[PDB]
Write an enzyme that holds these catalytic residues in place. Structure first.
Site, PDB file in Angstrom:
ATOM      1  N   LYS A 248      60.390   3.408  78.276  1.00  0.00           N
ATOM      2  CA  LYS A 248      59.703   2.589  77.280  1.00  0.00           C
ATOM      3  C   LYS A 248      59.184   3.453  76.131  1.00  0.00           C
ATOM      4  O   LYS A 248      59.204   4.686  76.183  1.00  0.00           O
ATOM      5  CB  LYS A 248      58.600   1.778  77.936  1.00  0.00           C
ATOM      6  CG  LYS A 248      57.305   2.510  78.185  1.00  0.00           C
ATOM      7  CD  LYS A 248      56.267   1.546  78.720  1.00  0.00           C
ATOM      8  CE  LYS A 248      55.678   0.704  77.611  1.00  0.00           C
ATOM      9  NZ  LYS A 248      54.721   1.517  76.811  1.00  0.00           N
TER      10      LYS A 248
ATOM     11  N   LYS B  89      59.101   9.760  75.095  1.00  0.00           N
ATOM     12  CA  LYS B  89      60.480   9.860  75.565  1.00  0.00           C
ATOM     13  C   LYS B  89      61.358  10.643  74.593  1.00  0.00           C
ATOM     14  O   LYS B  89      62.073  11.565  75.002  1.00  0.00           O
ATOM     15  CB  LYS B  89      61.052   8.462  75.827  1.00  0.00           C
ATOM     16  CG  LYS B  89      62.585   8.393  75.938  1.00  0.00           C
ATOM     17  CD  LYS B  89      63.117   6.944  76.122  1.00  0.00           C
ATOM     18  CE  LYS B  89      62.844   6.031  74.915  1.00  0.00           C
ATOM     19  NZ  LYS B  89      63.402   6.555  73.628  1.00  0.00           N
TER      20      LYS B  89
ATOM     21  N   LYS C  13      62.821   1.906  67.824  1.00  0.00           N
ATOM     22  CA  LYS C  13      61.399   2.147  67.610  1.00  0.00           C
ATOM     23  C   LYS C  13      61.042   3.623  67.538  1.00  0.00           C
ATOM     24  O   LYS C  13      59.878   3.952  67.289  1.00  0.00           O
ATOM     25  CB  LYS C  13      60.572   1.480  68.720  1.00  0.00           C
TER      26      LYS C  13
ATOM     27  N   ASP D  37      62.758  -0.890  78.122  1.00  0.00           N
ATOM     28  CA  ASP D  37      61.482  -1.548  78.358  1.00  0.00           C
ATOM     29  C   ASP D  37      61.787  -2.943  78.871  1.00  0.00           C
ATOM     30  O   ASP D  37      61.781  -3.193  80.086  1.00  0.00           O
ATOM     31  CB  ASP D  37      60.654  -1.601  77.070  1.00  0.00           C
TER      32      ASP D  37
END
Ligand code: SF4
Lengths: 285, 287
Positions: free
Chosen positions: B9, B14, B40, B128
């Protein structure tokens, strides 16, 4: 009946604000339905005092197909008579949010759930990656007044900008409009000023600033809203103020999305983001 | 060539761990390509010292079709000779993230970006809500080895479980497998024990625990990995250790996803989440 939606990213208290707003409307005598469309949050837990409400997707698979589903098993009533439904997030690896919400809305429409004394429907929608699937309530002209929950942080404001882009995309049909921004406070200095400035650039308003207050979590731990847990609390009056302003709102607009450069300028002006020293980029120690 | 994907997520570091791991492999003598598949985050900025890399989706939209694009404008080389591409997220309101990722990968294949000398490709994927779209790299057999970045927090562990369910969905028909969990520390007590326990329940391993260290931020502000900014720092050794364990890994499993009750049980067992008092549920302050 006013067809509304709350959009925003995860992790900033969007669904807690939605349910507390809805409880305040029910307290005012309005008949409301919440349709949960956020795979990452429990959109109805505080109205029903529940651990998890059975979803349309799960129950349709339990009865074989959505055709043999009974409305009584998916539509539940909680605090103040508020009616609660969960769409069901996508089947991992296979599903699409756009298909799930089409299925839920078509089911509720065929079973006559929108025909009642209903004053408001609120879709609680995940608004982060505003792909075609999570924008389906916009495309299908069901989420006609949108309120964006955000906070004074880059990712939440980026999400507000992308939600606004989705509204712009469908402006030549239907009637989907932005009604305002709701700031869920994170106890950051100048946060209210920042979201007011974002709303101004977008062409809308900050309809309310929701404070942080321990009573919110004291009610959440009991699986309830502040309106139900302690109707004398200061924070209950904050949700009543938000509810009054939503009821009375006539300022619905097609927003004007901003560039990432303009967003970074806002974050710097209000002290969230520091200026980039372009002279040390790529320089080892 | 080993085709890997990092899923997890957002908001937990990450893409920072992916780029630092890739930089350690390049320092080890490996030829690597990163393909960014996360709307994102920025999967290539620390390899290129870039503010933003032009994406395939954006360039295809300006040029007209992906057929009008040249590989030289989408594929750029950075630190250690690592090659970098960004798929580009979906156009807000209309696009599907997976359709864009598959369009991007097919363009790279047709233009010969997977040279016969490549040791690794790493797809950096948002994991996610694991819808059909973000599982498209799994369904289309583009990544064989999946590594999950998570942390000792409910939403990150829920994401890890959802990614595992996506892997299971396609396991009987294909060769995609789970290679391990990578813990991005958040300075939470017993976090490593929590992810070791989760990995065991899922049937996999905790391949590495990545600590938090201010040197990561000091490199980030300069648009760099820790391997390039200060290869002598201790954190630089953690990324090297992670890179070695990925190269050497042979544990590739069909996972066993857990239920939400079992997940809450783990979180309560390791101190993250308190026990719920059923007696006060639904009770007003007046009661
Ligand atoms: S449109 Fe969005 S929700 Fe639907 S499969 Fe694609 S990325 Fe997932």
């Amino acid at each position: 009946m006013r067809q509304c939606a709350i959009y925003g990213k995860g992790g900033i208290g969007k669904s807690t604000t939605t349910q507390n707003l809805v409880a305040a409307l029910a307290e005012m005598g309005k008949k409301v339905m919440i349709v949960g469309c956020d795979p990452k949050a429990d959109s109805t837990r505080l109205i029903l005092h529940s651990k998890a409400q059975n979803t349309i997707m799960e129950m349709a698979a339990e009865a074989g197909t959505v055709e043999d589903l009974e409305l009584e098993d998916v539509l539940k009533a909680g605090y103040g008579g508020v009616k609660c439904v969960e769409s069901g997030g996508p089947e991992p690896g296979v599903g699409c949010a756009g298909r799930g919400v089409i299925t839920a809305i078509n089911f509720l429409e065929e079973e006559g759930a929108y025909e009642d004394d209903l004053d408001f429907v609120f879709y609680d929608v995940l608004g982060d990656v505003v792909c075609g699937g999570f924008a389906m309530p916009i495309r299908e002209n069901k989420a006609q007044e949108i309120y964006i929950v955000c906070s004074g942080e880059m990712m939440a404001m980026y999400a507000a900008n992308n939600i606004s882009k989705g509204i712009v995309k469908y402006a030549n049909s239907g009637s989907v409009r932005l009604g305002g921004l709701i700031c869920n406070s994170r106890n950051t200095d100048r946060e209210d000023e920042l979201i007011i400035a974002l709303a101004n650039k977008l062409g809308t308003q900050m309809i309310h600033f929701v404070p942080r207050d321990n009573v919110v979590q004291r009610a959440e731990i009991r699986r309830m809203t502040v309106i139900e847990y302690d109707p004398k609390a200061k924070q209950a009056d904050e949700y009543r103020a938000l509810a009054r302003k939503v009821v009375d709102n006539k300022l619905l607009v097609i927003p004007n999305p901003i560039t990432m450069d303009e967003l970074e300028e806002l974050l710097m002006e209000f002290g969230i983001m520091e200026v980039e020293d372009e002279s040390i980029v790529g320089k080892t120690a």
